[PDB]
Symmetry: D2
Subunit: 265 residues, 4 copies
Amino acid sequence: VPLPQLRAYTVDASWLQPMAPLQIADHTWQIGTEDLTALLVQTPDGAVLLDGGMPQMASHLLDNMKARGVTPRDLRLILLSHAHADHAGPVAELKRRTGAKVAANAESAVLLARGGSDDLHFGDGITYPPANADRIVMDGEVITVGGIVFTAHFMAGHTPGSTAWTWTDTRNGKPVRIAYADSLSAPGYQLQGNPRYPHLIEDYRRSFATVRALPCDVLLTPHPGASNWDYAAGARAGAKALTCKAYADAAEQKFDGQLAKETAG
Amino acid sequence: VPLPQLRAYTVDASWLQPMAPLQIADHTWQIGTEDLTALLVQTPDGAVLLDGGMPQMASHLLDNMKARGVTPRDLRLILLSHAHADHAGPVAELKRRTGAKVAANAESAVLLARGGSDDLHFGDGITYPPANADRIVMDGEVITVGGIVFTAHFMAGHTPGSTAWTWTDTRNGKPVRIAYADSLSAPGYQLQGNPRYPHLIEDYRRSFATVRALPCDVLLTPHPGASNWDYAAGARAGAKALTCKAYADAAEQKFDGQLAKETAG
Amino acid sequence: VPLPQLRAYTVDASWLQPMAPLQIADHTWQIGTEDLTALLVQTPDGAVLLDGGMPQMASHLLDNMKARGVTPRDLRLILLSHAHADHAGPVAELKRRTGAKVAANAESAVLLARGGSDDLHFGDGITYPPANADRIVMDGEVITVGGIVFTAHFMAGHTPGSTAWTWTDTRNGKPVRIAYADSLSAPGYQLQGNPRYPHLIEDYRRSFATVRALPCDVLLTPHPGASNWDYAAGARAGAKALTCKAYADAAEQKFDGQLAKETAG
Amino acid sequence: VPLPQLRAYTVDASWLQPMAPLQIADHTWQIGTEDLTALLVQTPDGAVLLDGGMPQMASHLLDNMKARGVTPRDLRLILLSHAHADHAGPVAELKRRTGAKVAANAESAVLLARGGSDDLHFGDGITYPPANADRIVMDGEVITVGGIVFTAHFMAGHTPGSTAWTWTDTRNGKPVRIAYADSLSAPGYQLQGNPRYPHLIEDYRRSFATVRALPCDVLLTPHPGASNWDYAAGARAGAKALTCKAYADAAEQKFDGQLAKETAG
Ligand SMILES: CO[C@@](NC(=O)Cc1cccs1)(C(=O)O)[C@@H]1N=C(C(=O)O)[C@@H](COC(N)=O)CS1
Ligand SMILES: CO[C@@](NC(=O)Cc1cccs1)(C(=O)O)[C@@H]1N=C(C(=O)O)[C@@H](COC(N)=O)CS1
Ligand SMILES: CO[C@@](NC(=O)Cc1cccs1)(C(=O)O)[C@@H]1N=C(C(=O)O)[C@@H](COC(N)=O)CS1
Ligand SMILES: CO[C@@](NC(=O)Cc1cccs1)(C(=O)O)[C@@H]1N=C(C(=O)O)[C@@H](COC(N)=O)CS1
Ligand SMILES: [Zn+2]
Ligand SMILES: [Zn+2]
Ligand SMILES: [Zn+2]
Ligand SMILES: [Zn+2]
Ligand SMILES: [Zn+2]
Ligand SMILES: [Zn+2]
Ligand SMILES: [Zn+2]
Ligand SMILES: [Zn+2]
């Protein structure tokens, strides 16, 4: 009986379904797939990308940037929600093919640098090409590109380095406070007494309160379904979107249910 | 007028004054210098080192390990209070010359990997040979060597990755709960509105409470003077040592004074 | 039409077929699978592993080490032929689970550190968990463990960092010069005018001459079939093995044929 | 007697003496100090920097780039002769303060990543802030920026990763083949039987022949004195410059003398 073959990280087809750029605000666009967020923020001083989705999405992202008028040299900065294969997958390749540098917190930087291997919960089951961070950010630190100010809000739990990124764009004339809040799921995680993450529960609890309080005229999430976006719905893609408060509440009620099921299991 | 010469990181002579091993408990020894802590914990399954002091202390540390019966192959694990040059200085060289692997949190790992460069407060003024961590630890995570259980307690502030390490040794027959608590100083730091560390004050405040609550029959600190140890005093080196509560209180009162002076300056 | 799913690196079943340890010489054992080499050299001062095969072979390797009397703490050193997924696959995990440190040349170290991603020929098609080298070796440099002396012989081509490792064991009473020569294949490679490897042909040519001249009483190769070993054949596993000269000649004739086919294609 | 204080890497004042930009060709400028080369190549598609000199030269380099019309965002690429503190010193800081990415061979990348520590000859005596390479180049590989084509020519010896960089600029109307050849010195090195560099002599010998053969209308070197440039001499700074052949011959005769002195010592 031979050892098992390596199993590829396969995902729902919608996660891999290319879409054209979808405008969120005056300078903010969804340029990923139908079910994975990849946000492009275009400034007079270069472009910012928040997440890239899966590893095989690099060329599609570059195609959509070109459609927006962003050449490789114009991409200056990559920010991440968290460093799992379905959100940071193409970062290494994007750095090779563009001018982009990566800013992340220390936890996300060390997970990115090992390509998602030795994951606290998934082991080596969900890996991707490693990449190095060019700048380490602290909680509450701001990064400014072309006068758009991005603020990091750590929300540890889904990964230790999970981060919400907030910035203010404009929509019609008016300012719109965008919150790109990270996943709050704990899929198959051991929550209680986890030796690799002893304070997991306390961190999730604190992260629910962080998300509740974000400046949040428009919430986006790495899996759009988590915040009730439908990127395939065109003009009403965002119509049903949750508030940050509703997203946090829904995630906490699910988390409490999982805790109770874990105690029973 | 030429640019200034590089300035070496020079320190008080006592920080560089070798001492023979000084026993703290049945399996725990101070093996550094008179004014820099480097703790050796000897187990039937290999030795653990907590800090190494300055970069030029590597050979002295190895000499003192040999005096204790610890060969290079026997050193299994290096733990750190924080990754500044005066505490992690010789880690790279020790890894090259021994069997030792490094365990640290993500923040300390990324500062160690850049040799203390791009420090949040010191810039490139205080650097040392970079080293890689072999294992990343989470807050409250335990590491066990030869049946001595080391628990990490994050106490961010002096550096983002500052850590207290606790373990239980024996003294005479009886269990002794040793707390190796990190520095709580903020020397020359900008405390309020620091763009590189926006939550600095809140982190220090939380770290005072962490130190206050450590299991703490005997407190040790990276600078022994901070906890009123006198390593040159032989049998009463530890006689005047502070409790963790007194160490935390003294550090918080100093911190409050610095905050007030900063507001006035 | 969604983007393609990630494709796993799947291999012939024999590459994943566990085997019990097979003795090559007094202190040298094949402990990998039927069709992937992983050599254990046991010394009174700890064990050396040369290659680990595929990423999923880590537990099997540890099982075979235990069968040989080598505990995790006893594994001191991992050496590599080259840093592709089918030979260095489990190195990251072995470092986490054992005392082992990795020694490699700079080229192999940088490919290992990126988990085989951005391969000169395979791109991101054949990746694995990244690992860091603890020691960088130069061509002709020796490493000594328990009095067995390992010499590195660079043989760039299959990868830039491809290395032959030689050492002298004993067999019956007599010294046996073992050559663990790396692959000399160029599978699907663009050989001529390759912008990522401009001197590829000259390096292969030099590497054929390096292999021809190795001290070589017994040749082993990462794919045993390349040197006509049959690890499933028991007492005559090595009976048909090639000399280093015959291995080099066969690889050069194949290489010349590929060059001619490339010119015609 | 305390252990010695750390000794700073101090250098001749002329190495630290700022100079205004000095034009070498239509798009190539010396922008370092009087006695350390730092070459800026300006293209319509961004700027390239070849070396930065000492760690404290970062702000001066940025000042001279601004004088040339190169903003931080416009610096796209840093190339290196070799990764010692007096040539790669400010690379980490330049990467933090500019858009620049680093391309280097594997040997230079691993020495840069450890900030010049664990040097084959200097140990930890000559270190600097570590930096990561963004692209690894092979011997003979070309990199193109704004239509200037840079070719790497490995010339191992002074360091394992020592590299000559060649490109063609224009001067008046006519093409000028510029060779930025690395140091060929071996200052205080053990040349024969060096366990950390067993093939040192053969590598130097091959590197003399590489330099002899470079396309070389104008030779520049990291220490301008090595090629008889005088950056303080204005219009005749380059008047006395050596050919690549004369530079190689002078370095080989010095090397042969050192070998003979080493045999006698
Ligand atoms: C590595 O990626 C994830 N796992 C998998 O893909 C596959 C799985 C492994 C173990 C349980 S599931 C993960 O991080 O668990 C995805 N990302 C998520 C997020 O919250 O970021 C969740 C999204 O929730 C749904 N059903 O859409 C679960 S799927
Ligand atoms: C980099 O090392 C430290 N700085 C210096 O050496 C030198 C300095 C730079 C800026 C202000 S001072 C640092 O971290 O600030 C030492 N370590 C300490 C700790 O708390 O770990 C403090 C100990 O307090 C005293 N007076 O003994 C201050 S000295
Ligand atoms: C990444 O691993 C290898 N590729 C594959 O597995 C699968 C392939 C990708 C592209 C062509 S094939 C590689 O390096 O090309 C294996 N290792 C080899 C060595 O020489 O090390 C060769 C062994 O030759 C045979 N037929 O046994 C080819 S298979
Ligand atoms: C680390 O830098 C160098 N060492 C020192 O600075 C100081 C020294 C340490 C040991 C011997 S000297 C080095 O690499 O040896 C400089 N760079 C050089 C090059 O060739 O790049 C040489 C230039 O020759 C002269 N006299 O100008 C020697 S000085
Ligand atoms: Zn995830
Ligand atoms: Zn996800
Ligand atoms: Zn400190
Ligand atoms: Zn200190
Ligand atoms: Zn291979
Ligand atoms: Zn192979
Ligand atoms: Zn040098
Ligand atoms: Zn030099």
